Amino acid sequence: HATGLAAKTVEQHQAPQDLVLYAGWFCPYVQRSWISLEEKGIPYQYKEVNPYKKEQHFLDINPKGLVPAIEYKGKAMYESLILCEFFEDAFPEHTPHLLTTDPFDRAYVRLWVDHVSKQIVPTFMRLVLAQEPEKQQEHLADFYKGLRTLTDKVRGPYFLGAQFSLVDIALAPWVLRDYILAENRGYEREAAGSAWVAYAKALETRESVLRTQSDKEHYAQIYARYLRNEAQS
Amino acid sequence: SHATGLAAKTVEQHQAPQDLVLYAGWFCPYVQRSWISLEEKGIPYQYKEVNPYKKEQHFLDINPKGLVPAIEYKGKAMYESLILCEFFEDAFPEHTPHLLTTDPFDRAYVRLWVDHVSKQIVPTFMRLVLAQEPEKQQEHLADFYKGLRTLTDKVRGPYFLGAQFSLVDIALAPWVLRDYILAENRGYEREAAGSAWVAYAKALETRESVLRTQSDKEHYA
Ligand SMILES: N[C@@H](CCC(=O)N[C@@H](CS)C(=O)NCC(=O)O)C(=O)O
Ligand SMILES: N[C@@H](CCC(=O)N[C@@H](CS)C(=O)NCC(=O)O)C(=O)O
């Protein structure tokens, strides 16, 4: 179960609601969708899914079995980024608009969300799973490269500037987890450049992000998560 | 090096300058996705052919990654076919049809299945072209059929959502137009994927906006 401030948030979201969020406290993809709900003040019921003992209703409405998922007005959806966009569409008067209202900026947000999903997050995983120091160093260099492609475009404090957006939300969960890299894979924020130092700090101090954060897990736990993902591959 | 057939007429019809400039390659199925959306929605555009062997400096200036499709609109530029398709919905909100629908849940549903097209079906198709060994080719073809049935399990007909044409259809159509490559070179035939695939491919490749973007066929080279 969730701990820290996240435990407070879970306890405040036990009541039934039209929107049900099927979550895992540990899951960074869930955190993306959870941050969006906390940013926009959308009402939601939080249900904790134990992946080792998934309940039957969850599987009926969500047979692929991933979190996050939602049920809303009797229909179900999954995929963290799709849910983030769905919250924008389905609660149109619940500001902030995390894609902006501007058509080009919305496209630019989607482009850089894609960079997070395609480059940054997969390399984070490959670095955790790299075994030889040489392969670890190669994947760490690639992590820096992918971080720096993004920080080249960060206006500050957030990706678009003052306006928090889905680019920030897509990435923030992995900032919260980068102590794993610092403690086990030779990473330091400073080695990716000062812009990353400042942007990481901005993401991890965002109040919505803090409200979804549990106590730090151990390396063995996340490594176990990645081996389970491999086993489901 | 230029569009042919029906596509050459469409190109000829879009040489005048417009607010929206589409940087295109006639052969590119990703370009076709974005081109189809413009033709569905009646958005004014100017078509510019990018020859990949001699890219204009201005195209590289405003689009350093140098991919097509790309657009220039109001001094700003963007690329990635599906992002452009969503951009057309947002930037031209009164040009119907709304190819992701106007319903929040159905929009998410469309996004989910565009992803399955984008992340599963098209990559498998591409692994099957490049595979050379019976080993990888037999595997990728089986995978390809698996992805098609999974999709046609949800096709309502004539199109993915039913009567309403959508970005799921658009994301896949260019590879329906190209599946003769698989048929002539990799043991593929629509009929092995089920009657539903046969009908849905027919529906996609007879779509007027699709036909407008269709050049003569290329060879396995
Ligand atoms: N692409 C998905 C990834 C979601 C995902 O992989 N979630 C993991 C937990 S972090 C999961 O639910 N795995 C299924 C399981 O452990 O049984 C998304 O963006 O939501
Ligand atoms: N993910 C891109 C793929 C675009 C792509 O690969 N375009 C090819 C043409 S089919 C290209 O421009 N390659 C660069 C070149 O050949 O110069 C999209 O969806 O737009």
Of A77, A108, A111, the CB nearest to B108: A77
Architecture of domain A4-90: 3-Layer(aba) Sandwich (3.40)
Place of tokens 């101090």: A205
Instruction: Tell me the CA–centroid distance for residue A66 and ligand 1, in Å.
Output: 4
Contact B43, B53 (CB under 8 A): no
Closest CA to A184 of A233, A232, A128: A128
Contacts 24+ apart (CB under 8 A), B97-103: B97/B40, B97/B41, B97/B164, B97/B165, B99/B37, B99/B40, B99/B41, B99/B165, B99/B166, B99/B167, B99/B170, B100/B166, B100/B167, B101/B161, B101/B164, B101/B166
CA of residue A185 to ligand 1 center, whole Å? 24
Way the structure was solved? X-ray
How many angstroms from the chain centroid is the CA of residue A176?
A: 9
- The Cα A137–Cα A144 span in angstroms is 11
Task: State which fold the B5-91 domain adopts.
Answer: Glutaredoxin (3.40.30)
> Which tokens go with B5?
């057939």
Query: What CATH code would you report for B104-212?
Result: 1.20.1050.10
Resolution in angstroms comes to 1.6
Taking CA atoms, A166 is separated from A38, A88, A230, B6, B42, in Å, by 13, 10, 27, 40, 30
Residue nearest to ligand 1 atom 2, measured at CA: A79
Contacting residues of A for B109, CB less than 8 Å apart? 77
Is B218 within 8 Å of B1 (Cβ atoms)?
A: no
Q: How far is CA A195 from CA A127, A143, A164, B126, in A?
A: 21, 15, 16, 38
> What are the residues whose beta carbons fall under 8 Å from the beta carbon of A101, sequence distance 6 or more?
none
A186: left (phi over 0), alpha (psi -120 to 50) or beta: left
Asked if B153 has any chain A CB less than 8 Å from its own CB, the reply is no
The finding on whether B25 has its CB within 6 A of some atom of ligand 2 is yes
**Residue A203, CA distances (Å) to A20, A38, A172, A208, B63 in order:** 26, 14, 6, 10, 29
Residue A33: phi and psi, rounded to 5, are -70, -35
Rounded CA-CA distance A120/A112 in Å is 11
* Separation between Cα atoms, residue B78 and residue B90, nearest integer Å: 13
Fold of domain A103-232: Glutathione S-transferase Yfyf (Class Pi); Chain A, domain 2 (1.20.1050)
**Residue B138 backbone phi and psi in degrees, to 5:** -60, -35
Q: Which of A10, A19, A20, A27 is catalytic?
A: A27
Alpha helix positions (H), B44-177 = 57-62, 81-91, 104-116, 122-130, 134-152, 167-177
Query: Domain limits of chain A?
Result: 4-90, 103-232
Active site residue A27: yes
DSSP-assigned letter for residue B15: -
For residues B145 and B110, is the Cβ–Cβ distance under 8 A?
no
